[PDB]
Amino acid sequence: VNTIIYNVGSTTISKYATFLNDLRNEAKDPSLKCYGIPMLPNTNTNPKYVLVELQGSNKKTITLMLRRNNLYVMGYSDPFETNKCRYHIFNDISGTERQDVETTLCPNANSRVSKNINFDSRYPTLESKAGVKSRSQVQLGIQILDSNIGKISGVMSFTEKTEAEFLLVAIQMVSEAARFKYIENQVKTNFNRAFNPNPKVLNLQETWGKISTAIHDAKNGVLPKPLELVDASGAKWIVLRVDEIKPDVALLNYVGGSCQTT
Numbered sequence: 224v225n226t227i228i229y230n231v232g233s234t235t236i237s238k239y240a241t242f243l244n245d246l247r248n249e250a251k252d253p254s255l256k257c258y259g260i261p262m263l264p265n266t267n268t269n270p271k272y273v274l275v276e277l278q279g280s281n282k283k284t285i286t287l288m289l290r291r292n293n294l295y296v297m298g299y300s301d302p303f304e305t306n307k308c309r310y311h312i313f314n315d316i317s318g319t320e321r322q323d324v325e326t327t328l329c330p331n332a333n334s335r336v337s338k339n340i341n342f343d344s345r346y347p348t349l350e351s352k353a354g355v356k357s358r359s360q361v362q363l364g365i366q367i368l369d370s371n372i373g374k375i376s377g378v379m380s381f382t383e384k385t386e387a388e389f390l391l392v393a394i395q396m397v398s399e400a401a402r403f404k405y406i407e408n409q410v411k412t413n414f415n416r417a418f419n420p421n422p423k424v425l426n427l428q429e430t431w432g433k434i435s436t437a438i439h440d441a442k443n444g445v446l447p448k449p450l451e452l453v454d455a456s457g458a459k460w461i462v463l464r465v466d467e468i469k470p471d472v473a474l475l476n477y478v479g480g481s482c483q484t485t
């Protein structure tokens with residue numbers, strides 16, 4: 224399980240693009256690709272996990288745990304008290320998986336502590352503890368990622384609204400930007416300011432499974448039945464071929480079976 228280091232506290236757009244290109248390479252299966260887009264592995268490929276160590280201002284850090292299969296954030300760890308590792312598992316992680324998060328985030332038994340995330344990883348839940356109607360009313364941005372790390376890292380009590388806020392910014396800026404070349408670009412275009420997520424980024428997020436299925440199953444470049452999507456303005460967008468959607472997508476979700484490789 225490799226860990227990819229990224230310093231939030233001091234960056235430029237080349238460094239962000241190198242980080243995501245490093246997470247992508249690390250997460251993708253080495254050989255599975257459909258129409259030139261790399262595919263995430265089968266649950267069986269070892270390693271099953273990737274770790275992302277986010278380094279913020281002030282020697283505040285959080286390590287993000289991600290499953291290679293679907294790039295999901297299973298929980299996080301922060302350095303706590305002098306020599307302790309405090310792991311935080313999402314409420315919807317269960318079975319062997321929970322022991323894995325413990326073990327991989329804080330590899331040293333005798334120095335680890337629990338503080339669970341008492342809610343699940345889905346966006347409607349996260350919005351709810353954030354106390355917002357939609358993620359779009361909470362801004363994203365590098366400075367914001369940094370300060371959020373700062374509100375959580377090593378602090379004794381922090382409240383569910385602070386924790387859901389951190390998680391909404393982190394999942395969108397690490398897992399989503401890696402899946403979609405479009406969201407990576409939205410971050411680069413706004414690199415020195417906060418931005419609010421447009422409709423196309425929220426749409427792409429929620430339709431990533433269906434996109435993966437669709438490109439996998441597309442015959443001779445043409446999709447099985449046209450994909451209705453939303454563009455950055457709000458308008459309905461209809462795609463019929465893999466060339467239409469392929470510029471925005473950097474990683475396909477696992478869908479078993481053969482597909483046109485390249």
Ligand SMILES: Nc1ncnc2c([C@@H]3O[C@H](COP(=O)(O)O)[C@@H](O)[C@H]3O)n[nH]c12
Binds near residue numbers: 295346394428
């Ligand atoms: N902890 C997490 N890590 C990564 N992605 C997600 C998501 C995203 O939410 C999207 C849709 O989930 P639903 O179809 O159940 O609403 C997917 O893009 C998924 O990746 N929710 N929580 C996440």
